[PDB]
Structures are given as structure tokens and as C-alpha cells.
Design an enzyme around this catalytic site. Structure first.
Site, mmCIF file in Angstrom:
data_model
loop_
_atom_site.group_PDB
_atom_site.id
_atom_site.type_symbol
_atom_site.label_atom_id
_atom_site.label_comp_id
_atom_site.label_asym_id
_atom_site.label_seq_id
_atom_site.Cartn_x
_atom_site.Cartn_y
_atom_site.Cartn_z
ATOM 1 N N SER A 139 44.133 43.895 -42.078
ATOM 2 C CA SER A 139 44.916 43.823 -43.314
ATOM 3 C C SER A 139 46.410 43.686 -43.015
ATOM 4 O O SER A 139 47.262 44.333 -43.622
ATOM 5 C CB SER A 139 44.591 44.946 -44.300
ATOM 6 O OG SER A 139 44.925 44.534 -45.626
ATOM 7 N N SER B 121 44.718 44.015 -51.368
ATOM 8 C CA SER B 121 44.399 43.211 -50.181
ATOM 9 C C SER B 121 42.986 42.647 -50.181
ATOM 10 O O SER B 121 42.672 41.862 -49.276
ATOM 11 C CB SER B 121 44.602 44.023 -48.904
ATOM 12 O OG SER B 121 45.987 44.299 -48.667
ATOM 13 N N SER C 149 44.539 48.494 -50.842
ATOM 14 C CA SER C 149 45.269 49.688 -51.235
ATOM 15 C C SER C 149 46.549 49.228 -51.911
ATOM 16 O O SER C 149 47.126 48.198 -51.539
ATOM 17 C CB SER C 149 45.608 50.513 -49.987
ATOM 18 O OG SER C 149 46.224 51.740 -50.319
ATOM 19 N N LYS D 2 42.676 38.861 -49.861
ATOM 20 C CA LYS D 2 42.775 38.146 -48.590
ATOM 21 C C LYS D 2 41.498 37.384 -48.257
ATOM 22 O O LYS D 2 41.552 36.390 -47.522
ATOM 23 C CB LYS D 2 43.139 39.126 -47.472
ATOM 24 C CG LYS D 2 44.530 39.700 -47.648
ATOM 25 C CD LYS D 2 44.918 40.708 -46.555
ATOM 26 C CE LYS D 2 46.237 41.419 -46.887
ATOM 27 N NZ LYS D 2 46.559 42.382 -45.803
HETATM 28 C C1 LIG Z 1 46.419 45.515 -49.139
HETATM 29 O O1 LIG Z 1 45.907 46.131 -50.010
HETATM 30 C C2 LIG Z 1 47.660 46.012 -48.398
HETATM 31 N N1 LIG Z 1 48.282 47.089 -49.161
HETATM 32 C C3 LIG Z 1 49.601 47.320 -49.076
HETATM 33 O O2 LIG Z 1 50.369 46.611 -48.437
HETATM 34 C C4 LIG Z 1 50.084 48.533 -49.784
HETATM 35 N N2 LIG Z 1 49.744 49.753 -49.583
HETATM 36 O O3 LIG Z 1 48.790 49.899 -48.512
HETATM 37 C C5 LIG Z 1 49.142 50.964 -47.590
HETATM 38 C C6 LIG Z 1 50.410 50.620 -46.826
HETATM 39 C C7 LIG Z 1 47.956 51.119 -46.653
HETATM 40 C C8 LIG Z 1 49.345 52.250 -48.391
HETATM 41 O O4 LIG Z 1 50.228 53.043 -48.136
HETATM 42 O O5 LIG Z 1 48.487 52.435 -49.355
HETATM 43 C C9 LIG Z 1 51.154 48.373 -50.789
HETATM 44 C C10 LIG Z 1 51.925 47.265 -50.951
HETATM 45 S S1 LIG Z 1 53.011 47.475 -52.273
HETATM 46 C C11 LIG Z 1 52.343 49.068 -52.526
HETATM 47 N N3 LIG Z 1 52.776 49.850 -53.525
HETATM 48 N N4 LIG Z 1 51.394 49.407 -51.681
HETATM 49 C C12 LIG Z 1 47.069 46.432 -47.016
HETATM 50 N N5 LIG Z 1 45.794 47.063 -47.269
HETATM 51 C C13 LIG Z 1 45.252 47.844 -46.417
HETATM 52 C C14 LIG Z 1 43.834 48.117 -46.791
HETATM 53 O O6 LIG Z 1 43.632 49.191 -47.486
HETATM 54 O O7 LIG Z 1 42.950 47.341 -46.507
HETATM 55 C C15 LIG Z 1 45.772 48.294 -45.151
HETATM 56 C C16 LIG Z 1 45.068 49.054 -44.315
HETATM 57 C C17 LIG Z 1 47.127 47.791 -44.727
HETATM 58 S S2 LIG Z 1 48.274 47.413 -46.077
#
Ligand SMILES: *C(=O)[C@@H](NC(=O)/C(=N\OC(C)(C)C(=O)O)c1csc(N)n1)[C@@H]1N=C(C(=O)O)C(=C)CS1
EC number: 3.5.2.6
Length: 264
Positions: free
Chosen positions: A106, A46, A213, A49
Site C-alpha cells: 500500500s 487504498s 485505511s 489501488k
Molecule cells: C490507503 O488506504 C492508504 N491510507 C492512507 O494513506 C491513510 N491512512 O493510512 C494509514 C497511514 C495506515 C493510517 O494511519 O491509517 C490516510 C491518508 S489521508 C488519511 N486521513 N489517512 C494506505 N493504506 C494502508 C492500508 O490500510 O492498506 C496502509 C497500510 C498504508 S497507507
């Protein structure tokens, strides 16, 4: 003088972490850089973004009403994490609201609307190239842009390239003045960052950041930092692990930031 120690300490942190750590610092006081795996590719997750929001801000320089443009949110647009967009299903969000939701919460549905506004992942990449970033590539929408599979080039960059780009976007002239200020305001209002880079820095230093993440325990943060009494710093900390189901390690990013700060 302290740089050999910082290198040694980052390697020791990485060894204890079990994963792979990438760091890039730019100190804008004197353009000094400190890098650790700074030219290796990492999945952005992310943190990408920031590039998408900045690309929409660039479009808004020639369309004064663009940030107020409504975008429909349908039930089918919701993905794995969308705390803002779910409130607006069967309604709309403006491009400003989508930018703020993507950056500060996010929200992945919001990111997907930014990508679509740019004509898809290749449009985000085209903006990166237009501002001098030859390394960034966005290939997929969310959630799959976060799969973070080792060896996969999709949705990657290097710490060095991302630090340079974040500097240009937030402190340099890649965006117009109003748009640069808006990006900085959004990053400083991030809700997700207190456990990552910020946790390693003195509490008196102001930070704006974007976390990420993903799979393989990928845990990322990119930040602009205003230390007390000093020109700003830009810091990228990327971290990824060898097993698909690995747990998040925001503490490793805090530790990398602390090592960088103690060596300033
Ligand atoms: C960006 O990195 C987004 N990441 C994801 O959607 C994924 N995992 O993030 C979460 C849901 C927080 C997790 O359990 O680690 C993802 C998509 S496919 C996969 N294997 N994992 C957003 N990033 C964050 C961030 O860390 O900034 C969020 C708080 C919300 S999801």
C-alpha cells in the site's frame, strides 16, 4: 436459510462497533450474494489501488514491454506512506514494481504513479466503466483520496459494485488470462491483510486481498477467497466511523468475515 441470522448478526456487530459497516459477498459456487448496506456508498481509500493496477495490466495487454517501463521517482513525489518508493528516490521503478508496491505494501507514491500512467483519476474511472462498473469513482490522488469525509462522493463505491468488479478482475474475463493471473498473484502476496478479512476465516482457506485505511477511522478490505473444497468467494468489508480521528478497527472486518463464513 442462515441468511436472516447473518443479517441479524451483521447488524448487531455494527451496533456494537459504533460505526457504519458495508458487506458484499459473492459465492461463485452458485452466484448467491449476501449484502449489508450493499448499495450505500463508502470511501474506498487504498482498496481503489486494485482498480488502478488492473487498468495498467489492461494497458499491458497491448504493450508487452509496459510493465518493464521505468518511471522516475523524485523527492517531491513522496507522500505520507511510501516504504518502497523512498528507496528509489532520484532513481526509477518499473510499472510492475509500482503495481506490486501499491498492492502489496500500500505504497501511496506507487499508487500515484499508476494514476498518472492512466491520465489521472478520471482515467482510472474510465477503466472501471469499460469493465461494467458504473459505481466506482476515483477523484483524487493519494493521500487525499483517503480523507473519507462522511457524505463526500469522491473516491467512493458501494460494496455490491466493488465485489462484482473484483470478481470480474480476478475470476472473470475483464483482463487477459496472463494479466488476471498476475493480479491474483499480487493480491495473494499482500503483506497488510492478516488482521482484516483473513482473521475471520479458517486458516486453511487461501486469500488474496487489498486493505485500506483513512480518515474517520475508515477500515476496509476487499478479498478473493478460495475455501477448502469450494468454488471461490469474493468479499468486500467496508467500515467507517463518525469522528475524523477515530482509530482503525480491522477487528470489525474480521468479525464481519467470520459471520459470513459461519453462515456459508
Ligand atoms: C490507503 O488506504 C492508504 N491510507 C492512507 O494513506 C491513510 N491512512 O493510512 C494509514 C497511514 C495506515 C493510517 O494511519 O491509517 C490516510 C491518508 S489521508 C488519511 N486521513 N489517512 C494506505 N493504506 C494502508 C492500508 O490500510 O492498506 C496502509 C497500510 C498504508 S497507507
Amino acid at each position: 436459510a442462515q441468511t436472516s441470522a447473518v443479517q441479524q448478526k451483521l447488524a448487531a456487530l455494527e451496533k456494537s462497533s459504533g460505526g457504519r459497516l458495508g458487506v458484499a459477498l459473492i459465492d461463485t459456487a452458485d452466484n448467491t450474494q449476501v449484502l449489508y448496506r450493499g448499495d450505500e456508498r463508502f470511501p474506498m481509500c487504498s482498496t481503489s489501488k486494485v482498480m488502478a493496477a488492473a487498468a495498467v495490466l489492461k494497458q499491458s495487454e497491448t504493450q508487452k514491454q509496459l510493465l518493464n517501463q521505468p518511471v522516475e521517482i523524485k523527492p517531491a513525489d513522496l507522500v505520507n506512506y511510501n516504504p518502497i518508493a523512498e528507496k528509489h528516490v532520484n532513481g526509477t521503478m518499473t510499472l510492475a514494481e509500482l503495481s506490486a508496491a501499491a498492492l502489496q505494501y500500500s505504497d501511496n507514491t506507487a499508487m500515484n504513479k499508476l494514476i498518472a500512467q492512466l491520465g489521472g483519476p478520471g482515467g482510472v474511472t474510465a477503466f472501471a466503466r469499460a469493465i461494467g462498473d458504473e459505481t466506482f469513482r476515483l477523484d483524487r490522488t493519494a493521500p487525499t483520496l483517503n480523507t473519507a469525509i462522511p457524505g463526500d462522493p469522491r473516491d467512493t463505491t458501494t460494496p455490491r459494485a466493488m465485489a462484482q468488479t473484483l470478481r470480474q478482475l480476478t475470476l472473470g474475463h475483464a483482463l487477459g488470462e496472463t494479466q488476471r493471473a498476475q493480479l491474483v498473484t499480487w493480491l495473494k502476496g499482500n503483506t497488510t491483510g492478516a488482521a482484516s478479512i483473513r482473521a475471520g476465516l479458517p486458516t486453511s482457506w487461501t486469500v488474496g486481498d487489498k486493505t485500506g485505511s483513512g480518515g474517520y477511522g475508515t477500515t476496509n478490505d476487499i478479498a478473493v477467497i478460495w475455501p477448502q473444497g469450494r468454488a471461490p468467494l469474493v468479499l468486500v468489508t467496508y467500515f467507517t466511523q463518525p469522528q475524523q480521528n477515530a482509530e482503525s478497527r480491522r477487528d470489525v472486518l474480521a468479525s464481519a468475515a467470520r459471520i459470513i463464513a459461519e453462515g456459508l
